[PDB]
Design an enzyme around this catalytic site. Structure first.
Site: not given
Length: 107
Positions: A26, A36-37, A56, A82, A99
């Protein structure tokens, strides 16, 4: 509201079921923002199982709607990940996540 935009290739038939542990390359993306990731950075492709509420809600439904070899493009709503709380310092409140998801798994 999980909205799939599939980049085509794969098989389209090997669908994720219960009791199956899967492997995803991912990559996070904040909408109207930066990254962010990324599992592509650490090169450890995030082995996880299905159904036990590890991930999530938005990533869980989008994982089940794919197949082996595919390349999706999620859009997770705030209420499933979130958006009331926001992950502290990393994900702001009322956030909509993007994503790049590739399922290259087993089981």
């Amino acid at each position: 509201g999980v909205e799939i935009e599939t980049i085509s290739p794969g098989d389209g038939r090997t669908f994720p079921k219960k009791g199956q542990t899967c492997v995803v390359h991912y990559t996070g993306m904040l909408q109207n923002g930066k990254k962010f990731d990324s599992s592509r950075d650490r090169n450890k492709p995030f082995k996880f199982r299905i159904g036990k509420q590890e991930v999530i809600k938005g990533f869980e439904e989008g994982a089940a709607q794919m197949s082996l070899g595919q390349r999706a493009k999620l859009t997770c709503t705030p209420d499933v990940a979130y958006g009331a709380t926001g992950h502290p310092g990393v994900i702001p409140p009322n956030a909509t996540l993007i994503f790049d998801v590739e399922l290259l798994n087993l089981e």
